[PDB]
Symmetry: C3
């Protein structure tokens, strides 16, 4: 069933690209600008790959970019799939399985997030150090295939210690402040209330988003090393909370994206 | 994408029994159906006769759409609601809100029965809902978004209307009734909460707990309706001294709070509509 | 509404294999299946031969219904259970509890393997479950309610029976075993929790965390059964000093707590009401 769908997706991709990627990449809302850094051999539309969904959130372009960044073979999802769209988490996380099958060792994931920690600034890039999953579904529910990963994956260090060390070293070299923090995943699609933001803060979250955790969960099950970043697109201070609109979010995401466009190319040669 | 057609199919049928253009919609909760008597009624439409409307299976929920006038203000009321815990999707639960918005309603007034977690509450208090926490495991807006109904990512910084709640307080005060404001937490039910759960809910910042309302509010906000919300405290939820609760006691307390609402609502409607 | 039919069909087949009238039902968790050797069996029934029973797929869960006498008490024991994370609905998970009620059991004894969140716990501790927090994303009682089976809104003020736990403690002290009381939180799994998540579960008031049990307790309470619950602490979950966990170690610690329950349970059973 699952691994057979994985094998078919990868069998096809091999026929469109002879590359063996070291790093797999997932790029978030308003962060699609990052693909411009890649020397692209091929862009594979999601339809040409057996068992792939559809990207419908604005700014998510929806295609599989294959090539090289600083001479490091890579595969990048420019635009992702979201639970709030109506995709199952199996559908959301299938591209991760495919990256594993292609032979990537590391998944880099980026997203746009609300800043709950008051020490954050607008357009900060945060290094994800840990997460809290508050989504009402889990991508590993179902029969487990031990050829894919264990029944009970350990989550004591889902974000690679060595990768984040490198990410910090680069940030400092570039003179960029990248704080580390905890990412909380919620379903969406609505934004949070004032009272929900107070609760998430109390529970330990520094940023909140509607993605990423499902993919991280699947990456860890599959034995991939993870580096995640959040761009703080809006501030979520419940005692001074302003209405958020998608277009402002995309603007601030672009400024954070400019910073990742500096960081990521310096990071990749140092982690692979 | 076929929802907009479901909405029109239901709306047109409703118009074939009623002439009105309601300015306010109202949803009445457990033990609070009696509030419908306040309306000078043109017709009461059973949910059976409306395309795509669910059925109410909970005790005291009458299952009818009351259309009429309250204090000269045209109005539509759900006498009895639908809950997630009955087996309805949140799309089903919140369908009437879409229908109400289509009918032309500007404001949604929602009422519910709730457990009192804040120890300053008293039995039969009418709380003015100032904000909420959604602990339900589904979201009624999940799935494709139709931009003609609302935005993909609705803002929730002010789900309960500021001016509506200000009017609700002034009326309370001129009537001499204490209506505290606070935070409503929606959980799925159908079981009531454990002692350890009540402690956690309080710590999370909830003042009252219920098994409804939040889905309808989410959909109301997405649709651009202004919301006014009230919880009647039907049972006290203090974990160091929690007594068994039974449905029949909850209905009795609900009635004393309803009688308070039956005084508050007709005085509020003309000042917000 | 057709669940009774499924219940009768399963209770009929079981009477065909065993004419016993069980006083107690027992659910044996991960690595605890050895507790079934305490039963002087009359019959072991594979779940596959019982109408409507699912299949146990986690290691250590044998997937047999064990019927007999445990120190003189007629009993039915699930040697191995079902889990939401396996892809079962909670209706399927808890069907065996409905069956137990229909066979006549008055008390459900539930066991599980858990993570120890409270820093006062030790490895292999056997904890008396005093209350729970349900963080599962589905509820086994959602859907139409059959009054013949239980109330629409069960009370959860004392899910774990006060007298049963008092007897568990009396017997623990007689045997010289330390059995602390605490709150169990149920999460879906199947991944273990992150460090941030362990902190949050502590803050919410959890003492131990597991991936089962709560759905069965819910149904038990709905069905009028008295519940006695025990968690075996199989791994410690301190976020500032968290070590990776493998199922293999868990199973080894479970057996050590399992040895202790092997002593407790046969002493407790003849003493509870
Ligand atoms: N405030 C917020 N809440 C949830 N997801 C987000 N993504 C970006 N901002 C967010
Ligand atoms: N204690 C309680 N918990 C959840 N919903 C309720 N509705 C009325 N009382 C309640
Ligand atoms: N750490 C843990 N988390 C959740 N369930 C468990 N069962 C045993 N150990 C566990
Ligand atoms: O490493 C960090 O970014 C950090 C340090 C102190 C507090 C929060 N974050
Ligand atoms: O009685 C009060 O004043 C009260 C009630 C609820 C919350 C806060 N205060
Ligand atoms: O009875 C107990 O086990 C107990 C007492 C005090 C604190 C925690 N647990």
């Amino acid at each position: 069933e699952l691994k057979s769908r994985i094998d078919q997706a990868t069998a096809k991709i091999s026929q469109l690209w002879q590359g063996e990627p070291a790093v797999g990449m997932i790029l978030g809302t308003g962060l699609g600008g990052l693909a411009e850094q890649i020397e692209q051999d091929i862009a594979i539309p999601y339809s040409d790959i057996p068992h792939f969904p559809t990207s419908t959130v604005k700014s998510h372009a929806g295609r599989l970019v294959c090539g090289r960044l600083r001479g490091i073979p890579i595969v990048a999802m420019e635009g992702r799939f979201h639970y709030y769209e109506g995709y199952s988490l199996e559908q959301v996380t299938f591209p991760v399985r495919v990256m594993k099958a292609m032979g990537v060792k590391t998944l880099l994931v980026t997203n746009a997030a609300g800043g709950i920690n008051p020490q954050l600034d607008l357009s900060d890039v945060l290094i994800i150090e840990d997460h809290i999953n508050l989504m009402p579904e889990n991508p590993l529910r179902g029969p487990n295939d031990e050829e894919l990963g264990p029944r009970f994956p350990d989550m004591s260090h889902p974000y690679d210690c060595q990768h984040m060390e490198v990410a910090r070293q680069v940030a400092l070299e570039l003179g960029i402040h990248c704080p580390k923090g905890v990412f909380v995943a919620v379903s969406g699609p609505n934004l949070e209330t004032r009272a929900e933001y107070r609760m998430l803060k109390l529970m330990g979250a520094d940023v909140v988003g509607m993605s990423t955790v499902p993919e991280v969960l699947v990456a860890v099950h599959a034995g991939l090393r993870v580096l995640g970043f959040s761009v703080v697109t809006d501030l979520c201070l419940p005692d001074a909370l302003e209405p958020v609109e998608l277009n402002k979010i995309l603007e601030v995401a672009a400024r954070g994206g400019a910073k990742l466009a500096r960081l990521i190319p310096e990071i990749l040669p140092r982690i692979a």
